[PDB]
C-alpha cells in the first residue's frame, strides 16, 4: 500500500525534475545558440517561468499527502566494475562504469562550504533575540499579512 | 485594423494590471510564515528568496510595459485623433 | 578552454550548468533508486532532535532578508523610473502641428506634396520619420 | 491637445507612484518592528488606489 | 559528531585482513565515531559466546545485510526487543573498507535542490545587474535601391551570358 504511494511519489517527482531539467537545458542552449537580440524581458520571462513553475511544483508535490522521505534510506546492492549498457540506457547518456566511485559521489549530503558558512552565519544570527520578540514578530507579521491579503481580496471584488 | 489595434491595447493594459496585482499578492502570501514539514528550512528559505526576487522583477517589468502602453497611446493620439489635428490646422 | 563565442553571459551559464549537473544527479539517483537493481530502499523509523527552535528563528531571519532584497530591487526600479522620466513624442507634436503625417505598418510617413492643396502632380512626397531626437 | 497628453503624463507619474508604493509597503513589512501598522494600511490603500485609477 | 553523514572512518592496516566476520571485527577495533562503544556487541566481545549474545543481551545490534566478497559488505544497525524482533536504526555500507552511513531519501533531494536554488539565485542576481533601461531607448545591456535596378539587373544577366566567369 505505502510502497505504491512511494512509487507514485518517485515517478511524479522524477517527472517534475525532468521538466526542470528540460527547462534548464532549453534555457542554456537558448543562451548559447540564441545569444544575439536577447532582451531582459526574455530572460526575466525564462527565469520566472523556470523557477516559479518548477520550484513551486516541486514544493507542492513535496509537501502534500506524501510519505515521509526521511524514512526511506538509499542502499546499493552490487558493485560490479563492468560497462553495463543497460545502465547506460537507463540513466540517459551518462553514468560510466558502475564502480567504487559513483555511489560515494552521489550519496553526498554535505553541501558546498559557502552555504555551510551561510548556515554558520544563520546560527550566529540565531544567537540574537528569541522566543519573545521572535513569537511577537511571527504573530504580528502573520496578522498584518492576513490583513493586507484581506484588503486586496476585498478590493478585488 | 484600428479596432484590432485598440483591442490589443486593451489586452495589454488588462494583462499588465493583472500581473502587478498577482505578483504583489503572491509575494504577500509567501511572506506568510508557516510551520515546516518535509521542506528542510534552508531549502525552503532559498526557494522563497528566489520567488520574491523574481516576482519583484516581474512587477518592475509590468511597470515598464505600462510605460510602453502609455507611449503607444500617446503616439496614436498625436497621429490620428481628428479633432486636435483640426484645431492645430485652424490655429 | 573556449566556448561557442559567449564572452559575456558566461558566469550565468556556469551557475546554470552546475544546476544542470546536480539536477542530472537527482534524475540519476531517483532513476537508479527506482529500479530494484543497483540501488534499494529500506524503510527506517529514525528521529532527530532539533537543538534550537529552528523554524521560528530561521524562517524569521530568512524572510526578513528575502523581503529586504525584494524591496531593494523594487525601490531601485522605482527610482530608476523617477530619474528616467525627469522627448520623441513632443517632437511628434510639433512635427504634426506643422506637417501632414500618417502611420502605415510600424512606419510613420508624411506627405510633402501639394496634393492636399490641389496639385495633380504625379509625384508623392512621402518622407519617413526616423527616431535618431527625430529626423526625416 | 495638452489635456489628454497631460493625462498621459500624469499616468506615467502614477505608474512610478504605484511601483514606489509597492516598494514602500514591503519596506515597512521587512522592518524588525513595524509600529505604524496604520501607516502600513495607508500605504496599502495608496497602492491599490494608484493601481485602480491607473 | 554534528553531522554524522559528512564523516568518513577507515583503518588502513585492517584492509588486507577482510573476511565476512572480519568486517564486523574491522567495525569494532575501537574509535569509530559511527559504531558505538556502548553497543551490546562490545559486551559480546568482552567475555565469550558470540553466537547468542546478540539475542540474549537485548538492545542495539549491528547486523550485516549483504555480502560481496571484495569490497561491499552492508552493515545495518537495529534495535531488538526480543528474539525475532528486528527494528531498523541506521545503515552503514562499506566500500573498500570505508564505512559510509546511508543517507535518507529526503536529505539528498533537499541538498541537491538547495544547491539548485543557490546556483540559479547567483545566476539571476548577476543577470539582474546587467540590464539597463530607459523609456526612450528601451532595454540594453551594460556591456538603398533606386528602382531603375531592374534594368541594370537585366543588363547584369546579359553581361553574365555575354561574358561568362572563368575560375
From Swiss-Prot, chain A:
It is found in: Nucleus. Residues 1-26, 131-157 form a coiled coil. This is Mediator of RNA polymerase II transcription subunit 8. The chain holds residues 3 to 159 of 268 of the full protein. Residues 140-149 are annotated as: Interaction with the Elongin BC complex. The modification Phosphoserine is found at residue 80. The elongin BC complex binding domain is also known as BC-box with the consensus [APST]-L-x(3)-C-x(3)-[AILV]. Component of the Mediator complex, which is composed of MED1, MED4, MED6, MED7, MED8, MED9, MED10, MED11, MED12, MED13, MED13L, MED14, MED15, MED16, MED17, MED18, MED19, MED20, MED21, MED22, MED23, MED24, MED25, MED26, MED27, MED29, MED30, MED31, CCNC, CDK8 and CDC2L6/CDK11. The MED12, MED13, CCNC and CDK8 subunits form a distinct module termed the CDK8 module. Mediator containing the CDK8 module is less active than Mediator lacking this module in supporting transcriptional activation. Component of the Mediator complex, a coactivator involved in the regulated transcription of nearly all RNA polymerase II-dependent genes. Mediator functions as a bridge to convey information from gene-specific regulatory proteins to the basal RNA polymerase II transcription machinery. Mediator is recruited to promoters by direct interactions with regulatory proteins and serves as a scaffold for the assembly of a functional preinitiation complex with RNA polymerase II and the general transcription factors. Transmembrane segments: none annotated.
Curated annotation (Swiss-Prot), chain B:
The chain holds residues 10 to 100 of 200 of the full protein. Component of the Mediator complex, which is composed of MED1, MED4, MED6, MED7, MED8, MED9, MED10, MED11, MED12, MED13, MED13L, MED14, MED15, MED16, MED17, MED18, MED19, MED20, MED21, MED22, MED23, MED24, MED25, MED26, MED27, MED29, MED30, MED31, CCNC, CDK8 and CDC2L6/CDK11. The MED12, MED13, CCNC and CDK8 subunits form a distinct module termed the CDK8 module. Mediator containing the CDK8 module is less active than Mediator lacking this module in supporting transcriptional activation. This is Mediator of RNA polymerase II transcription subunit 22. It is found in: Nucleus. Disulfide bonds: none annotated. Belongs to the Mediator complex subunit 22 family. The gene is MED22. Component of the Mediator complex, a coactivator involved in the regulated transcription of nearly all RNA polymerase II-dependent genes. Mediator functions as a bridge to convey information from gene-specific regulatory proteins to the basal RNA polymerase II transcription machinery. Mediator is recruited to promoters by direct interactions with regulatory proteins and serves as a scaffold for the assembly of a functional preinitiation complex with RNA polymerase II and the general transcription factors.
Swiss-Prot record, chain D:
The chain holds residues 6 to 59 of 117 of the full protein. Component of the Mediator complex, which is composed of MED1, MED4, MED6, MED7, MED8, MED9, MED10, MED11, MED12, MED13, MED13L, MED14, MED15, MED16, MED17, MED18, MED19, MED20, MED21, MED22, MED23, MED24, MED25, MED26, MED27, MED29, MED30, MED31, CCNC, CDK8 and CDC2L6/CDK11. The MED12, MED13, CCNC and CDK8 subunits form a distinct module termed the CDK8 module. Mediator containing the CDK8 module is less active than Mediator lacking this module in supporting transcriptional activation. Coiled coil: none annotated. It comes from the Eukaryota. It is found in: Nucleus. It is linked to Neurodegeneration with developmental delay, early respiratory failure, myoclonic seizures, and brain abnormalities: An autosomal recessive disorder characterized by congenital microcephaly, profound global developmental delay, exaggerated startle response, refractory myoclonic seizures, progressive widespread neurodegeneration, and premature death. This is Mediator of RNA polymerase II transcription subunit 11. It comes from Homo sapiens (Human). Belongs to the Mediator complex subunit 11 family.
Curated annotation (Swiss-Prot), chain E:
The keyword Plastid does not apply. It comes from Homo sapiens (Human). The gene is MED6. It is found in: Nucleus. This is Mediator of RNA polymerase II transcription subunit 6. The keyword Cytoplasm does not apply. Component of the Mediator complex, which is composed of MED1, MED4, MED6, MED7, MED8, MED9, MED10, MED11, MED12, MED13, MED13L, MED14, MED15, MED16, MED17, MED18, MED19, MED20, MED21, MED22, MED23, MED24, MED25, MED26, MED27, MED29, MED30, MED31, CCNC, CDK8 and CDC2L6/CDK11. The MED12, MED13, CCNC and CDK8 subunits form a distinct module termed the CDK8 module. Mediator containing the CDK8 module is less active than Mediator lacking this module in supporting transcriptional activation. Component of the Mediator complex, a coactivator involved in the regulated transcription of nearly all RNA polymerase II-dependent genes. Mediator functions as a bridge to convey information from gene-specific regulatory proteins to the basal RNA polymerase II transcription machinery. Mediator is recruited to promoters by direct interactions with regulatory proteins and serves as a scaffold for the assembly of a functional preinitiation complex with RNA polymerase II and the general transcription factors. One of its GO terms (biological process) is RNA polymerase II preinitiation complex assembly. Its main location: nucleus.
Amino acid at each position: 500500500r505505502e510502497e505504491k504511494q512511494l512509487e507514485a511519489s518517485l515517478d511524479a517527482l522524477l517527472s517534475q525534475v525532468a521538466d526542470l531539467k528540460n527547462s534548464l537545458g532549453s534555457f542554456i542552449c537558448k543562451l548559447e545558440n540564441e545569444y544575439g537580440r536577447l532582451t531582459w524581458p526574455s530572460v526575466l520571462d525564462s527565469f520566472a517561468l523556470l523557477s516559479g513553475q518548477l520550484n513551486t511544483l516541486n514544493k507542492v508535490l513535496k509537501h502534500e499527502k506524501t510519505p515521509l522521505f526521511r524514512n526511506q534510506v538509499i542502499i546499493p546492492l552490487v558493485l560490479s566494475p563492468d560497462r553495463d549498457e543497460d545502465l547506460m540506457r537507463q540513466t540517459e547518456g551518462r553514468v560510466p562504469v558502475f564502480s567504487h566511485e559513483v555511489v560515494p559521489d552521489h550519496l553526498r549530503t554535505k553541501p558546498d562550504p559557502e552555504v555551510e558558512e551561510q548556515e554558520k552565519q544563520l546560527t550566529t544570527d540565531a544567537a540574537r533575540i528569541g522566543a519573545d520578540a521572535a513569537q511577537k514578530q511571527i504573530q504580528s507579521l502573520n496578522k498584518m499579512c492576513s490583513n493586507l491579503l484581506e484588503k486586496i481580496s476585498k478590493e478585488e471584488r | 485594423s484600428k479596432e484590432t489595434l485598440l483591442q490589443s491595447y486593451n489586452k495589454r493594459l488588462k494583462d499588465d494590471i493583472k500581473s502587478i496585482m498577482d505578483n504583489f499578492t503572491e509575494i504577500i502570501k509567501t511572506a506568510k510564515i508557516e510551520d515546516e514539514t518535509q521542506v528542510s528550512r534552508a531549502t525552503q528559505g532559498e526557494q522563497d528568496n528566489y520567488e520574491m526576487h523574481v516576482r519583484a522583477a516581474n512587477i518592475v517589468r509590468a511597470g515598464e510595459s505600462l510605460m510602453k502602453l502609455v507611449s503607444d497611446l500617446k503616439q496614436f493620439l498625436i497621429l490620428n485623433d481628428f479633432p486636435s489635428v483640426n484645431e492645430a490646422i485652424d490655429q | 578552454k573556449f566556448q561557442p563565442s559567449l564572452w559575456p553571459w558566461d558566469s550565468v551559464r556556469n551557475n546554470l550548468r552546475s544546476a544542470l549537473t546536480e539536477m542530472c544527479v537527482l534524475y540519476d539517483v531517483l532513476s537508479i533508486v527506482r529500479d530494484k537493481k543497483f540501488m534499494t530502499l529500506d524503510p527506517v523509523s529514525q528521529d532527530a532532535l532539533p537543538p534550537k527552535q529552528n523554524p521560528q528563528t530561521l524562517q524569521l531571519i530568512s524572510k526578513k532578508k528575502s523581503l529586504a532584497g525584494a524591496a531593494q530591487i523594487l525601490l531601485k526600479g522605482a527610482e530608476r523610473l523617477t530619474k528616467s522620466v525627469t522627448d520623441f513624442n513632443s517632437e511628434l507634436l510639433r512635427l504634426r502641428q506643422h506637417w501632414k503625417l500618417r502611420k502605415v505598418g510600424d512606419k510613420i510617413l508624411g506627405d510633402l506634396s501639394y496634393r492636399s492643396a490641389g496639385s495633380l502632380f504625379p509625384h508623392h512626397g512621402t518622407f519617413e520619420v526616423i527616431k535618431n531626437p527625430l529626423d526625416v | 491637445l495638452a489635456n489628454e497628453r497631460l493625462r498621459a503624463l500624469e499616468d506615467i507619474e502614477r505608474e512610478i507612484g504605484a511601483i514606489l508604493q509597492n516598494a514602500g509597503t514591503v519596506i515597512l513589512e521587512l522592518s524588525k518592528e513595524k509600529t505604524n501598522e496604520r501607516l502600513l494600511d495607508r500605504q496599502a490603500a495608496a497602492f491599490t488606489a494608484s493601481v485602480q485609477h491607473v | 559528531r554534528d553531522n554524522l553523514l559528512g564523516i568518513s572512518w577507515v583503518d588502513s592496516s585492517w584492509i588486507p585482513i577482510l573476511n565476512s566476520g572480519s568486517v564486523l571485527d574491522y567495525f569494532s577495533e575501537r574509535s569509530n565515531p559511527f559504531y558505538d562503544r556502548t553497543c551490546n556487541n562490545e559486551v559480546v566481545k568482552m567475555q565469550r559466546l558470540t553466537l547468542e549474545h546478540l539475542n540474549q543481551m537485548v538492545g542495539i545490534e549491528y547486523i550485516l545485510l549483504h555480502a560481496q566478497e571484495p569490497i561491499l559488505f552492508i552493515i545495518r544497525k537495529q534495535q531488538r526487543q526480543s528474539p525475532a524482533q528486528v527494528i531498523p536504526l541506521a545503515d552503514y555500507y562499506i566500500i573498500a573498507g570505508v564505512i559510509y552511513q546511508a543517507p535518507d531519501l529526503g536529505s539528498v533531494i533537499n541538498s541537491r535542490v538547495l544547491t539548485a536554488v543557490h546556483g540559479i539565485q547567483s545566476a539571476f542576481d548577476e543577470a539582474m545587474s546587467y540590464c539597463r533601461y530607459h523609456p526612450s531607448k528601451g532595454y540594453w545591456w551594460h556591456f538603398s535601391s533606386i528602382f531603375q535596378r531592374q534594368r541594370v539587373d537585366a543588363l547584369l544577366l546579359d553581361l553574365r551570358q555575354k561574358f561568362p566567369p572563368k575560375f
